[PDB]
Design a protein around this ligand. Structure first.
Ligand code: NA
Ligand code: NA
Lengths: 396, 396, 396, 396
């Protein structure tokens, strides 16, 4: 017998520069420094990911106003094409609904966009609406999102750090260091040696116990990944992440079989929905699944993905997605540690992931975050008023 | 921002005489009239389920008092042995916890009782405590439980009725009638003819379109179930329910292959946890899963079970458990209709399912329940003060 | 030693009203008349597909100008969000390339968009660029596209007709009639009877031999599709098409097993790339695969999809996509007949499919098309100058 | 719009002495120096492949004259028996056809010869005719064949060299050296040691990084191949090629499982058609497929084979067939390097592969071939007028 507000209006905005699009940069950043990609077989696209257009979309901001004056928002990747989808297509299912109608809303967004959806941009868009809906609901109930997700199961988050400097991540208190791979199969035996040299160097600097992992960003083939993982076992690599293109379900299962015993094969960043993850889990593709909350369907969908993994006794370590991941992973038994992305250009200082777009964003202190930092309603952040919002589309 | 109360005490009561134990009944009920069981191979044990001791436990009542004065409660089947387990084992994980610590508490309960749990009585007990925690959280929040489970996805529930008179159920506006099987394999060819005559009689009464189903209460073998299912094709039987003992996963998968095409094989009321239902789904055992919320692991666990069935594109139609089902199934895309047990002795009028235990319990009117009937906090019921609770155990 | 031109400029335009978006209508059309969809479980979205936003995108026109003054174009579904992708992302891979660089271009478009692509809108966009590239190449060589695809293997195309009136399609010379399904699972036994009545009526009108098929537009579940196909065998239904959501690979394989012997199960309209079709073929999902040229990756990708099917000895009967399908299917041994979509509102006269957008569009005469009608360079059509082109984005 | 010439005549010639028959050689060649074969279990047949009759056929030359005066040609292995087949069987499908009728003609050739084809000599003949049709179409169009096959995907080919001197191949700038096996299972433990000493010697000469490969010409059994592969691990053998007879699909799949992890198993030079290569890929027989364009079904069929390997994410590295490979592999994303046979007797200098048959034949310079070297129409070669063609058959 609480008075549940209805949704008055949904708006989509475009923002540009850093934030929820991680690869929307323009400087001397590690995240654009010769990262191996599927495009790296072309020499002219090898140095920079921005050169093939990793930064083309920008940030989608979804804002949902309720009848009580509460506003939820989320940031994700999608920019102007995603804003068109929110305003012209998706908003019709939201406006006039109760803020508790979350299951209904997701299903309607998914079913209505199926003919041009399933994976990719359209699912990113759905996810951003979903996140904004969970933020709004938390704001309405005056509760952090983790309290709406069955409550935290640990009083502290522990992080590994993703970036070019695991050695410095160690000095900053993190439990591990995930490095990007810099050389793909088209650089032959020399690029392989270089990959292994980088790992050797970092291992020498950190000692035998600190976790090291490679992120390969879809860039290898089965034989190269097999040979890299075999080479890597000398330096105690914990896992090889996203070795293959996301459509290569058969390849991942082969790789996992051919991996050194005790080394993990992980994927799932570019996978969407319960049915994408069912395929990974059932085919044996995967030791850990690593969906992006903002790209896999949102919190609502990730909840079902996570329970799928629960039945499979698999780990779920989501893509670092600032508060959108922290509130989720706090509540999951199958998520014992979390990813933090190093968004400083030299990966040499801890910096908020969604700067400058977000305010109230907590960050790991000495590689940890107390649950008591996640005490504010919704996802506990506000949109920075200094950020320049464009609304390219309207509806009625 | 909202201040979250802690759990002050947990109490375990025993009630006897109807309610949550469906089979805790007096004389002259359909539910004890010659129902086919695994025990019917003994003629001494064939007429009455009470004679082999279907009614030995009765009702466990779990009460949880929060620090703000709020009290959540749930009823399930388990009685005095379950009450030992709540008071002496389980209450240690609850007392002093925040009322939102739901995922944690479940995990602690399951993992601490593993050495003597996994299935059966201990899971019933965990489910009861879990249901009481959801009741409490709903009461704290001043929201019905469906609003905590992602919102309703439909305006209205629609019911089939379970009992010996689907012809009367049709007049009362139900969509379907499920009838208990009365003869098992040991009664031979005459039993088979009697089973099918019973179905023929009801089909003649109801017309061609009305759904008819058989519930076999684990009582068959593969070949009898196959032949029963084949004979029932002529009268358009919609599904065969719980044909086989719940450990016979291999059998269920064979029966579903052997089934007349278009006819469903259903099970799972005597199955528990995500891993039990993973076996069922992955082995292709059934078209519909039918867990009892009060026997399978509670709302917390059913949530994961339901997500697993989402991924498998299977239906979940929970074994009717009054308000504990109703609030759940309202929210699930994969539960499009619901079970209503006909708890009247002659099955000739709608009676509240968990009568006389629960005050304020909604019933189907004309086979339907508007979602506005479930607008009261928690599961929307109060314990009948005219019921006399025994407390067999305390704890420090 | 021909002088091969390079690509000067790519442009993306938006058009609205009919054409390459088939469901972009606004009248009394059969194609929006109570078609069963995944959204049909909601009564308010049941009557009209436009009500959930099937028409939200519009038509993408991709125009590619070469250095010799030749211009290729294609029309597909995608509208303004697709136009953004063409102009801002994709055009960089095309401008400065030789017009023969088709394999290189496709791979670069696919690999660069993988992080937000794989299926759906992004693949539609790629397909439209690809089609425009093949049109351009044909214009340059002064040859129809079928001559660039290994040449036609038949001198005539034979069509079935998709629409609400197979009886009239028969009088117009077509070999078959594919009808849309009007009632889904949520309309229960009554909607089933109605579906079967429609098929009964049409069968009575056409005689025993004329092909009848159902298109279900992703709208059923396994049991409903199983029961519909079993019901349908009395009236000699040739195939059931797109019964299930496109992610339900496991469901399709089950359905195909449970189909009446000799009845075909088909899908693939909402499937993309070689790897999507590999999954369908290998899992046994499918008797015929039915990709849309404008949605599966374009001609370049469909060529590999088709050769996959060749190895599988499976039929490929693409979605009717006017000239974009006719030039392709002419050359394929595994494509012995073709789809024609009935774009007249009452499906009562043969009408060009991409009217008003295209000029020079051939249409079946008496259910057939001579290969001699496909004698003009490229896909042999021109953009109607009366159509109102908007260019919402530019680049440099 | 461009007027398409018809096929006027087809002629079949026989040449002897090098060229397209690799094994049609005189004395003192490495390619006949004690090469391990299935016949080496007979000591009488161990020293020389010519002694069991590797050289019995020689070169089939197929010439096709179009009505505009253009003449296409191809060389493959088959000689006088193949020439019977071209003239008496196959020419009926070609004469009077448009030169673009390539898919049709292939299909007619395959389907008319099925009763005595499927594999082997008849497929060689079909491949020769097919290659000549592509030559003709290129000459008609005034385009090289790579521009008809979707365009080059790379600026440059890179080669490994096949012959008894990979040490000399390294100095000549090749990326790799593949060496023939000289001892098979019947030569026992000493043969095995000799095989590995040979590899050790080359590894010492070339350094650690240069690719080394063994080509076993069908000569092993499973256990010998497993033990050979295991011994070769120490010297970093990149792949084992054609270890087993081509009918032993089950064997290849076992060997690849038994292989040292990271080492590739390759086959397919003596395999033909899409269905042969489907068996190979689906059974997990090999990491690289290696068809000969002149033995597998021609360019038309290789195109489908290549697409099947695309879907399987496998590499296609065709068995070097001079310009017929080079034009093909230029276009394929899945052929990143290419084979060059060292046709010099002592393998000490680059000699044109199909010398003395083909005038204008390009060679690798420094292990590489710029795409600008293949700028001449068709396959860019002319028949050497100093070669003396026999015409054993005519036809009406
Ligand atoms: Na039951
Ligand atoms: Na070879």
């Amino acid at each position: 017998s609480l008075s549940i507000p209805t949704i008055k209006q949904v708006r989509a905005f475009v923002l540009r520069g850093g934030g929820a699009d991680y690869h929307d940069q323009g400087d001397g950043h590690w995240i654009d420094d010769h990262i191996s990609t599927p495009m790296g077989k072309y020499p002219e696209y090898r140095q920079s990911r921005r050169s093939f257009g990793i930064n083309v979309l920008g940030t989608l901001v979804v804002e949902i106003e309720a009848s009580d004056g509460n506003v939820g928002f989320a940031v994700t990747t999608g920019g102007e094409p995603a804003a068109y989808i929110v305003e012209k297509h998706l908003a019709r299912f939201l406006e006039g609904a109760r803020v508790t109608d979350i299951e209904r809303i997701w299903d309607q967004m998914y079913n209505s966009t199926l003919y041009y959806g399933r994976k990719g941009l359209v699912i990113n868009t759905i996810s951003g609406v979903d996140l904004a809906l969970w933020d709004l609901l938390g704001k309405v109930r005056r509760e952090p999102v983790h309290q709406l997700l069955g409550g935290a199961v640990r009083d502290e988050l522990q992080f590994y750090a993703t970036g070019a400097r695991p050695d410095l991540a160690q000095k900053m208190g993190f439990i591990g260091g995930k490095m990007p791979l810099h050389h793909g199969p088209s650089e032959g035996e020399e690029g392989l040696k270089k990959n292994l040299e980088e790992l050797a160097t970092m291992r020498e600097r950190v000692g035998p116990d600190f976790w090291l992992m490679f992120d390969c960003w879809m860039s290898l083939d089965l034989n190269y990944a097999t040979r890299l993982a075999r080479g890597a076992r000398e330096y105690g690599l914990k896992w090889i992440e996203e070795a293959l293109p996301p459509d290569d379900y058969w390849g991942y299962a082969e790789l996992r079989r051919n991996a050194p015993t005790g080394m993990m094969v992980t994927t799932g960043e570019h996978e969407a929905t319960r049915w994408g993850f069912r395929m990974l889990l059932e085919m044996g593709c995967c030791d850990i699944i690593q969906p992006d909350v903002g790209w896999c369907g949102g919190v609502t969908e990730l909840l079902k993905i996570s329970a799928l993994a629960d039945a499979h006794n698999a780990l779920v370590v989501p893509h670092g997605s600032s508060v959108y991941s922290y509130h989720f992973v706090a509540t999951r038994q199958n998520s014992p540690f979390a990813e933090f992305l190093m968004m400083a250009p030299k990966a040499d200082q801890v910096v908020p992931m969604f700067h400058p777009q977000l305010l109230g964003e907590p960050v790991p202190e000495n590689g940890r975050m107390r649950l008591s930092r996640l005490d504010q309603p919704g996802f506990g952040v506000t949109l920075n008023p200094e950020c320049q919002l464009h609304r390219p589309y309207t509806h009625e």
